[PDB]
Amino acid sequence: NTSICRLGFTYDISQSKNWGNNKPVIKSIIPYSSAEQAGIKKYDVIEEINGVPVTEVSVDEIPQLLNPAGRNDVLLTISNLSSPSKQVLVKKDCKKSNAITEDQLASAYAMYSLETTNEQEFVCPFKTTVTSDGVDFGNFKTFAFSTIDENNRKLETVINECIENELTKKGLTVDIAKPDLLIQTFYFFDKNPNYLGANEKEPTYRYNFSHSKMEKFPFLNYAAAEAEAEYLLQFGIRIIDQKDIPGRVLWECEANELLEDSYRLDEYARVHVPLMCMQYPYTKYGRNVPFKVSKKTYNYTGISYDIDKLDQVVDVDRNSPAYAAGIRPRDIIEKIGRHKMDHSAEEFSSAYKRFITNTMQYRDPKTMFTDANGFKYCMFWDVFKYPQIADASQSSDYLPAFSYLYYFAPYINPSGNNACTFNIKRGKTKLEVIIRPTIRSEVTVEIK
Amino acid sequence: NTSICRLGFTYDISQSKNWGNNKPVIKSIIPYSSAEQAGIKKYDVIEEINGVPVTEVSVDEIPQLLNPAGRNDVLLTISNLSSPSKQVLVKKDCKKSNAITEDQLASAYAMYSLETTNEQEFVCPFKTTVTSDGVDFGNFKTFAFSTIDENNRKLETVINECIENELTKKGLTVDIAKPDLLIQTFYFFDKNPNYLGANEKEPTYRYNFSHSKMEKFPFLNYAAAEAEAEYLLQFGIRIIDQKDIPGRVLWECEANELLEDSYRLDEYARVHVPLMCMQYPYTKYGRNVPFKVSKKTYNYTGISYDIDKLDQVVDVDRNSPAYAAGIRPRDIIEKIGRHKMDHSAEEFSSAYKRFITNTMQYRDPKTMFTDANGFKYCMFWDVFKYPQIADASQSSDYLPAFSYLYYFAPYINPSGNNACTFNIKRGKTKLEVIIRPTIRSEVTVEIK
Ligand SMILES: [Mg+2]
Ligand SMILES: [Mg+2]
């Protein structure tokens, strides 16, 4: 009955002295949102809301000002590394309070396709250090790389090409003549002397000059885990100021990795330069960076369902396959493919739980992982058991009406036809429409 | 027959770009040596040897030039943080090839007194980072502390007083008006969010943008040991240039400690400021600093013994208690106290091994430690068993003639008399002299 609204981005009230201090800083953009389409990008700084500067208003009233009651389109004054000022009109993303979207259902029925829809977390051993001077990083618009060590030309060119792509994507530009910043990289790869050719918790002893004796200290002595590494890897990025206080290191990120086998620094840089630079210009973690990867792929039609009476269309997105097919709100879905829809939420929930139970045998334990929400037994399907999974997935006992969301996968829909049949009834008139869905694919890589 | 010689210090050919590059840098001074008395100090840079600059000569011929054949006194041109040039005449420390000194014997019979004579190693979680500019740290002679945060005045005053003592000992001087350097400290103490109220090796998963998927990486995932810590401690020293390139951080040392209980940052600074500053100006370890503590206390008389015929005096140090008592080389020691000396080296070695075996029962297992040379079962004597240790230590079966080296300890000599009786025989004339020894005490704290 009441309509809920959202802005297509997540943000922080920045505590960083060098990037949009005590202002909203965008952390992530919601895919397929209006904020995305309007051109809002990660690490953007909200300077003003609807003409009022964010400094001239309390921190507690920023969420209300960003989601006004009467207004629908929020005018934003943005700053980033591309420009110091920019006007952006962000349209709101609204839905009915009782609407269940295909995005929500793709997440609820994710175990049909863990291969495409999951969340995972990881932590990187990055030490990120910035200048103690409260200089805004937005003052530096251009960069150049420091002189290449000819002994390592091949490697240094790969590293600098990775950093160049990351920084040009941020809105920074190369100027070899008079750069605002100089980029410097340092790296190391060699054997660990503390490796004993072997793979408990020890006490911490230190010398105390004040008492002229060795003493036990209540610190964790991790020195035994260090011995487990044969090799040591170091990789760092140094961003040196050339204009405000020349020679001052503005930002430095150093990765220190404990290695089991031999590893290539070029391969290491290719993977980690993009993860390391996610904290330039917005640094919030100094020692161990937490990341969250959320991936999702589903068949999109544009239909929203009633949270209570699920066989009822509550809305149809404006430029969607279901709209183009002629589906309209208040329609009643008789069936999707060969599966009836006149079931309760608990009928669907129980039937789904039965499917996961009865197909645990077709999962691959070599792929077992713990997802971001703490679930320990995530497994992909076994590649030699897809025909058996597809058959089990389509058993009427498991109420597979919503399995259409994953009809692009051969472990759900073996037939070479992603087009879904929707049998609707508006009043007493019964129609059958074939909806070829569009595939909504999305990956969000966010610093927690 | 041939006399061996040494210089009273250990050194490196420095690989540091900011401190005596490709020149000898003194690491440690040998206590009671001529180099010590001449005023050679740790981290001194040998600029010239006997008038010849160390740059104008090969690295391979520096040890020979430092220990000449014909010459006995080596004239050194030194540089440090106190002065850019200084003339130092270092006398050599010589001994006969067949001489066994009381210093050597104190180390060989150390298990009489582990409490006073042992070696231990420890590693500190210090990250030490220096400027990539090859500026000599000797260009900066004065310092001042940066403005105190009034919210933490009590703590910041303790920290700065510790750093002030360390740097003034190095030869640096305070100048609040126009300092060459500004010292800045940063610190943090709070609970670990990753602590689960609990006290295996996990795989490393990271996101690879090049392949748009999570991947296993051959890196050690230590994230489980991080969870064991309730609290996190950070403590850092920042040395900022004010004259050459103002604002440039020359040297920075950051300690990151994983804590079991609550801990005071003032107490932490008091202990670690002296360990952290041992790498200013000579930094050779960037990430995990290895230290070695060598302590020794023995009764010194000045007598040197023959490695083969041990009851024969091969030398008597010039200003020693044995010299003052009238002991002279070629004398024959009949007995020390009530213990005869006419035994072989294996007679003494076996008798000593029997004593350690038979007194293992009087050791305190609560004190068990692994020494620097890798011995796992080092234990001090049990404080309630000293009378029994003293009796066992003086049993003629264990040939305790050399136990006089530890006669100042009540677990060896219960009587309140540190004066030792030496019964000698020169030719056929037999004399008894009472030697009150001097107590040689020494602690060496060195970066490995
Ligand atoms: Mg190997
Ligand atoms: Mg506790």
Side-chain angles (χ1 to χ4, degrees), chain B residues 54-88:
Chain B
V54 300
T55 63
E56 300 177 13
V57 140
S58 177
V59 167
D60 302 294
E61 46 190 317
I62 268 160
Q64 288 75 42
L65 225 71
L66 274 170
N67 195 87
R71 203 169 171 90
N72 246 20
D73 279 14
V74 201
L75 184 60
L76 254 47
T77 300
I78 297 300
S79 83
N80 54 37
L81 300 176
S82 258
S83 66
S85 200
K86 173 199 211 153
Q87 291 299 97
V88 184

Side-chain angles (χ1 to χ4, degrees), chain B residues 173-190 192-193 195-198 203-221 223-301:
Chain B
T173 176
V174 186
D175 180 29
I176 301 160
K178 226 179 170 58
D180 289 331
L181 308 163
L182 190 78
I183 283 81
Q184 201 156 74
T185 52
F186 54 108
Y187 46 84
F188 177 90
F189 189 81
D190 198 49
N192 171 15
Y195 187 61
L196 273 319
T204 304
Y205 297 100
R206 307 225 172 130
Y207 190 80
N208 182 186
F209 280 99
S210 336
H211 294 130
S212 279
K213 64 174 179 209
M214 290 287 287
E215 286 176 6
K216 192 191 156 79
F217 281 85
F219 318 148
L220 286 173
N221 185 27
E226 276 257 340
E228 305 294 303
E230 329 189 7
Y231 298 95
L232 306 164
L233 194 145
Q234 185 190 255
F235 177 67
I237 306 165
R238 209 176 251 115
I239 299 178
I240 307 128
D241 179 7
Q242 304 300 96
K243 56 172 255 176
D244 210 293
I245 300 156
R248 173 181 63 168
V249 175
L250 302 171
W251 184 98
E252 191 175 302
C253 192
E254 199 187 292
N256 290 286
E257 217 69 73
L258 291 187
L259 264 77
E260 311 185 275
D261 298 293
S262 179
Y263 203 85
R264 293 188 67 91
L265 277 163
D266 48 35
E267 282 174 31
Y268 189 86
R270 283 199 193 274
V271 176
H272 299 87
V273 158
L275 299 167
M276 286 169 68
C277 293
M278 270 178 71
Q279 286 207 110
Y280 192 77
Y282 186 53
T283 300
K284 57 169 167 161
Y285 297 98
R287 227 174 68 89
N288 295 117
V289 198
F291 300 86
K292 201 196 155 168
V293 190
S294 301
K295 73 170 179 171
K296 184 185 295 191
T297 303
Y298 65 100
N299 272 339
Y300 172 77
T301 73

Side-chain angles (χ1 to χ4, degrees), chain A residues 6-11 24-26 29 34-36 38-41 44-54 62-68 71-80 83-92:
Chain A
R6 210 237 293 106
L7 282 95
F9 58 83
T10 65
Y11 73 93
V25 168
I26 316 286
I29 273 85
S34 295
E36 189 185 67
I40 304 285
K41 307 278 174 69
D44 271 357
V45 174
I46 302 176
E47 294 282 351
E48 316 175 353
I49 307 164
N50 292 315
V52 45
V54 300
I62 268 160
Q64 287 75 42
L65 225 71
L66 274 170
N67 195 87
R71 203 169 171 90
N72 246 20
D73 279 14
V74 201
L75 184 60
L76 254 47
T77 300
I78 297 300
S79 83
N80 54 37
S83 66
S85 200
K86 173 199 211 153
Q87 291 299 97
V88 184
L89 185 78
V90 174
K91 302 198 167 189
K92 240 181 272 177

Side-chain angles (χ1 to χ4, degrees), chain B residues 149-161:
Chain B
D149 160 47
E150 281 303 317
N151 299 290
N152 289 287
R153 169 159 285 277
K154 296 183 186 77
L155 166 67
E156 287 196 25
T157 297
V158 172
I159 298 171
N160 293 346
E161 268 175 38

Side-chain angles (χ1 to χ4, degrees), chain B residues 368-411:
Chain B
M368 197 182 322
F369 67 97
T370 304
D371 77 358
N373 42 95
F375 184 48
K376 282 152 71 182
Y377 312 118
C378 300
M379 292 176 290
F380 306 132
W381 297 118
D382 180 301
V383 192
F384 309 100
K385 281 153 182 193
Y386 283 15
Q388 299 102 276
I389 302 148
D391 296 342
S393 83
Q394 297 304 290
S395 315
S396 283
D397 175 39
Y398 311 130
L399 307 177
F402 293 109
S403 70
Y404 82 88
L405 291 160
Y406 293 109
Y407 255 41
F408 59 82
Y411 42 84

